[PDB]
Structures are given as C-alpha cells and as structure tokens.
Amino acid sequence: GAMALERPEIDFPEGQPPEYLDITDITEGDGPEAVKGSNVSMHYVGVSWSTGEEFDASWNRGSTLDFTLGTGRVIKGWDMGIAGMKVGGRRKLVIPPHLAYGDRSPSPAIKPGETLIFVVDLVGVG
C-alpha cells in the first residue's frame, strides 16, 4: 500500500519495479500540479509503434481523464506521469510494456525498436 512497487504493487512479491516510465516535463501553466490526492484532469496522445508518429493515445478517449492521483492508483507509471504534471502544461511520456502499454509486452520491449511516445497535457486539477 505504501508503494514498494512503483505505485500499484502487484505482479511480483511487491517491491520489484520496472521504472521504465519515462517522464519529460514540457511547460507548466495554470497554477497547481496533479500530485497525490489531487483530482486529475488531463489527456495524452501516442506516437509511433503502431503507425509511425502521432496517431492516438490510451488517454485519448476524446474526454479528459478525471481521476484522483493517490499512490497505487494505477499502473507502475501512470501515477508517476501525473504526479508532477502541472495544470496547463505538457509532458512527453515514453510508454513501457512492463508498465503503461499493457504490462504484457508484444515486442522484445516495445519502446526502443519501436517508439511509444504519449504526449500529455494537464488541463485541470482539483
């Protein structure tokens, strides 16, 4: 519950994290930053791996994702990506297959041979 593994704490006997979640913060706008207990509202869009460059995100459902961050909330890196995001700012996130893609992995490690880039924008907090 205290996040021995990244955030989730599953798969392994807990405490064995991949950490492949790649964070790159790109601008910060409105004021607050989504981090633990803070209501989250944001969107991503993924590039490459499927068709070469920007095509669609997991987060890209048309609607902004609204959920409260808070430690073990989601997979091994979604809590990581949001935790730090600032409302009205952007981030470049690289999606791991031992984390964000599926934690099941299609390729050797879909990300390097491929290129899974999910560009994110925080647009609101609680």
Angle at 115 between CA 112 and CA 120, to 5 degrees: 130
User: Helices in the chain by DSSP H: which ranges?
Assistant: 78-82
C-beta neighbour count of 39 within 10 angstroms: 14
Amino acid at site 10 = I
The SS3 call for residue 82 is helix
Domains and CATH numbers, the chain: 22-125 (3.10.50.40)
